[PDB]
Amino acid sequence: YPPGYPMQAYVDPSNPNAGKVLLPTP
Amino acid sequence: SVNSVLLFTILNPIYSITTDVLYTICNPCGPVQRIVIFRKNGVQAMVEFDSVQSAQRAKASLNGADIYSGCCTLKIEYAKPTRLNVFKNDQDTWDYTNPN
């Protein structure tokens, strides 16, 4: 799996998967 | 109604969605058995896991995440079929328990 991913761009207290990026951009 | 099959609706599908992409992001959540991708009106995919527990781990971990930054936002629900029927292995459908 690409190092560093899934990556949490920011943490939203209302929504744990908001800001979550599963893979680097092709 | 829980299920071991999930329906992924991929909002804003800017990048190519293939069985390899979906296997890569889903199998760390739980063992994937089969994938079917529908491309007619947007992109939706069905992903069948080994168990309900794996499907629930995939749904909890990925629902509302983006596959790639700023796009490909995942809406995940339980699918209607309780198993997927796959007859070929390619970029659109795959059965990891039936090499052809």
> What does the domain layout of chain B look like in residue ranges?
1-100
Is residue B8 within 8 A of residue B74, CB to CB? The reply is yes
Interface test with A, best of B11, B62, B69, B73 (most A CBs within 10 A): B69
Cβ distance A22 to B68 less than 8 Å, yes or no, reads yes
**In 3D, which of B27, B63, B17 has the Cα closest to residue B48?**
B27
DSSP A1-26: --TT-SEES--BTTBTTTTEE-S---
A18 touches B at CB < 8 Å: yes
Distance from C-alpha of B64 to C-alpha of B85, rounded to nearest angstrom: 27
Distance from C-alpha of B28 to C-alpha of B25, rounded to nearest angstrom: 7
Cα torsion at B36, A23, B78, B89 (round to 10°)?
20
Chain A closest-CA separation from residue B59 CA (Å): 11
Residue A13's contacts (CB-CB under 8 Å, 6 or more residues apart) are none
When CB atoms are compared, the residue of A15, A18, A22 closest to B67 is A22
**Cβ neighbours of B97 (radius 10 Å):** 12
Is residue B35 within 8 A of residue B85, CB to CB? The reply is no
Is residue B48 within 8 A of residue B35, CB to CB? The reply is yes
Task: Tell me the residue length of chain B.
Answer: 100
Pairing relationship of beta strands B93-95 and B66-68 according to DSSP bridges: unpaired
Tell me how far the alpha carbon of residue B2 is from its chain's centroid: 15
Cβ distance B65 to A6 less than 8 Å, yes or no, reads yes
A4 touches B at CB < 8 Å: no
Helices (H), B3-73: 19-26, 52-62
Q: Helix B52-62 and helix B19-26: axis angle, to 10°?
A: 100
